[PDB]
Symmetry: C4
Subunit: 223 residues, 4 copies
C-alpha cells in the first residue's frame, strides 16, 4: 500500500551514510547516485500528481501536493547552489514523504485542534515552573558551584534536564537545600509527564464517539 | 493567529529573559544597562495595564474577576519594591513575578482547577503513596549498602536522594548500587517508577473525561428527554 | 482536599518517619540525637492512645466493617515496642518505619485503587510478564554483542540485565553503555519499546479508574428505564 | 494461584541460563546449573506429551500456537546440547521465554488492541522516526565543528537523538554549544509529548475493547426480542 514511504527509507539512510568520516571514494559516489535515482522517482511522482486534471473528481489534497513539490525543488536547489560537500543534508526534506500516505495524521490534526487550547496552556505551564525552579536553583548554589549554576541559563539547563526527567548528570546540586529542591522538581516532572497523556487521550475519545452519532442512534434505532 | 489575543503575556516573554540575562557573569557594563532598561519599559507597560484595569470599574450587572486583578497588582508593586528597597545587583530576580502574567489570559486554568478539584481526593493520595514507596525503598537501600559505600548510602536521606532520582526515572548516575542485592532492588525501584507514571496519567485521563461529562445535562438530558 | 482538615492520624506520621532518617546520620551530636529519639516516643505514645480510641468504642450503629483499619493501628505500636526491648544495638529505630502504613489508613484513595487493581489485575500482571520477557530477551542480545569488547560491563547476562532495566525503564544511569555499532542500534530499540512499556501502564489505568464511576448508570438508564409490566408483587 | 504451572518452571530455567554465563565460576557449581536446565527440559518434554496426547475439550478446537510453544521448548534446547560444542550453548534455552506467554489471558486481548489501533501506532513510529532524524540533522549542523567525535556524523547525532527523545538521558554525548543546548531543551520536551502519544493512543486502545465486550451486556442483553432478529 505505501508506495512513496518505501522510497524514502534508503534515501534518508543515504544522507546519513554520506556524513560518515573515513569513507572510501568509490563507495561514497555510489551513495550519491542512490540519492539521484530516488530524486528522479520523486520527480516522476510529482508528474503523476500534477498531471491528473480533467480526469480527477472532487478530492481534497492541498497538503499532499506541497510535499511532492518540496521533495524535488530543495534537492535541486542544493544540487546547483551549494558547492561544498555538505549538500546532501538538504535531501532531508524527504522526511515529509512518510507523512503523506498515512491515515494517522489527518486524525491527529483533529486531536491537536479540539484540544489545542489545553495543550499550549501546558507548554507555558512547563516554562513557568521550569523558570521558577531555575530561579531558586540559582539563588541556592550560585556560590558553591560557580560555573555550573552560575547564571539562570546555566540553571535553566538543569531545569530542563530535571523536569523532563532526561537526567544527564553534568550539573547536579551539591547543597542540602539544593538537593531537596531537585526532589520536588523530579516529582513535578512526573505530574506533567502524564498530563500530556491525560489530555491527549481524551481528544481521541470524542472522535470515536462522533461516529457513534450515526452507528448507534441512526443505524440501529432508525432502520 | 495569537498576536493580539494574549496581549498581557507577550510582554512577559522578553521580561523574564531579561531577568535571566542580567545574572550572567562577565557581562559588559554597557549591555548590562540596556537589559536593566528593558525591564523598566515593560514594568511601565504593566503600570499602564494596571490603570486600564483599576480605573475602569465597568462591569454591567454581575461580573467577578478578583483573581485577574490580583496578578496585575503584584506585577507592579513587587518590582517597584525591589527597585527601591533592595540595594544589591540581585534586585532583578524579583521581576519573575511576571510568571503569573501568562497564567492570566488563557482559558485553561479555570478548566484545570475543576479537574484538580474533582479528582483532588485521588491525586493527593498518589503523592503520599509516592512518599511511602520512596521512603521504604531508601530504607532498604540504606541497610544493604551502608557498609560498602559509606559516603553514598551512609544515611537514609543519602538513599532518599537515590530513591527520588531512580523512582522518577530521572536517574542521574551519581549514586548507584554496587552490590548484587542492591542492584536487584534498583530494578524493582525503576519498574515501580513506571507504575507511578501510569497512575498519574490514568487519573488525569479520568479527570479530563469528567470534563466531557458536563455536557450530559444540556446534550443528553435536555435534548433526549 | 483531605490534608489540613481530615487526616489527623497521618499528620503524626510525618515527623515520625523523618526522625527515623535523622537518627541514622553519622557524626550526630548525642544531645540532639537523644531529642530525636525522644520525639519517636511521644508519637508512639500518641499512637498507643489512638489504639485504645479504636478499641474502646468497638461499634457505632448496627454492623460496621473496619478490619483493615485496626490491623494498621496495632502494628503501629507493637513493632516499635518490639525494637525498643528486644534489639539493643544503635540500629533499632528503623522498625519505626511501620508507620508508613498510617497514611494508607485515613485515605479514600486505596479502597478505590483496590477495586482497580482487581478488575483489571489480569491485564496488569500480563504487562509485568511482558516486561520480564522483553527485559531478558534484549539482555540476551546485549551479552552476545559486546562480551568481546567491554568484558566487564557486558560479560554476563546479569550485567546485561542491569542495562536492560536501566534503559527499558528510561532511567538510564550511564555506567553501562553499548560501545559497538550493532549494540547501539538495538539500544535504541530498547529505548523505543521503552516508550511503549511506559505507556502501556498508562493504558490499563486509563481504563481502570474510568470503569468505576460508569457503574451508576447500570440501574438508572439501563435496568430501570425500560421494563415489562408486572415484575415485582410477591 | 497454582494455575500457571507451565510458567513457574520457566523462572529458574531462564535464570540458570544467566548463571551459566558468569565468569570466575567453579566447575562444581557450573555443572549444577547445567543439571537444573536438564530437569526443567525434561519437565517440558513431559508437558509436550501431555499436550499432544490427551484430548477431551471441544469438537475440533483451534490452539495451534499453544502447542507450537511447547514444540520449541524441547527441540531447540536439545539442538544446542548436540550441535554446539562451545561452553556457550545455554543461550539457546532462552526459548523458554515463550512459556509464560502460553495462556496468560493478556496477549490474546492485547492483539486486538494492537489491531483496532495498529493504524495509529505505526503512525507514531514513523513520526518518532521523523523527529529523531530531524533533530539529529540539526545537532550535527550545530556541533560538527566543536565536538568532532560526539557530533562528527549523523549516526553520532542520532545516538544522542534516541537518548534524549526517549528521555533516557545517558550523559555521554551532550551538546556543549548554546544553540544545541537550546535545541536539546525542545528535544527533551517533544519527547514528553510522544510519551503521551502512545500512552493516549493505548488509552483508547483498551477503551474500545471494554466497551465492545459490553455490546453483549448493554446492547444484546438489554435490547432483546424473540423472533424479531435474524441477519
Ligand atoms: K539519566
Ligand atoms: K546520567
Ligand atoms: K523518563
Ligand atoms: K532518565
Ligand atoms: K554520567
Amino acid at each position: 500500500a505505501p508506495l512513496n514511504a518505501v522510497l524514502a527509507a534508503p534515501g534518508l539512510l543515504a544522507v546519513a551514510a554520506l556524513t560518515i568520516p573515513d569513507m572510501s571514494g568509490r563507495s561514497r559516489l555510489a551513495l550519491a547516485a542512490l540519492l539521484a535515482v530516488i530524486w528522479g522517482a520523486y520527480l516522476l511522482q510529482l508528474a503523476a500528481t500534477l498531471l491528473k486534471r480533467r480526469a480527477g473528481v472532487v478530492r481534497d489534497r492541498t497538503p499532499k501536493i506541497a510535499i511532492d513539490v518540496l521533495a524535488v525543488l530543495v534537492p535541486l536547489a542544493a544540487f546547483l547552489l551549494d558547492g561544498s560537500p555538505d549538500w546532501s543534508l538538504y535531501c532531508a526534506v524527504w522526511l515529509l514523504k512518510p507523512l503523506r500516505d498515512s491515515t494517522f495524521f489527518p486524525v491527529l490534526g483533529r486531536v491537536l485542534a479540539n484540544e489545542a487550547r489545553n495543550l499550549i496552556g501546558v507548554t507555558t505551564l512547563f516554562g513557568v515552573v521550569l523558570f521558577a525552579v531555575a530561579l531558586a536553583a540559582y539563588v541556592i548554589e550560585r556560590d558553591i558551584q560557580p560555573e555550573k549554576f552560575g547564571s539562570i541559563p546555566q540553571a535553566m539547563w538543569w531545569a530542563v534536564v530535571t523536569l523532563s526527567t532526561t537526567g544527564y548528570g553534568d550539573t547536579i546540586p551539591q547543597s542540602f537545600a539544593g538537593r531537596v529542591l531537585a526532589g520536588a522538581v523530579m516529582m513535578s516532572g512526573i505530574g506533567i509527564f502524564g498530563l500530556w497523556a491525560g489530555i491527549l487521550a481524551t481528544g481521541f475519545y470524542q472522535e470515536v464517539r462522533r461516529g457513534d452519532f450515526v452507528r448507534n442512534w441512526q443505524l440501529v434505532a432508525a432502520v
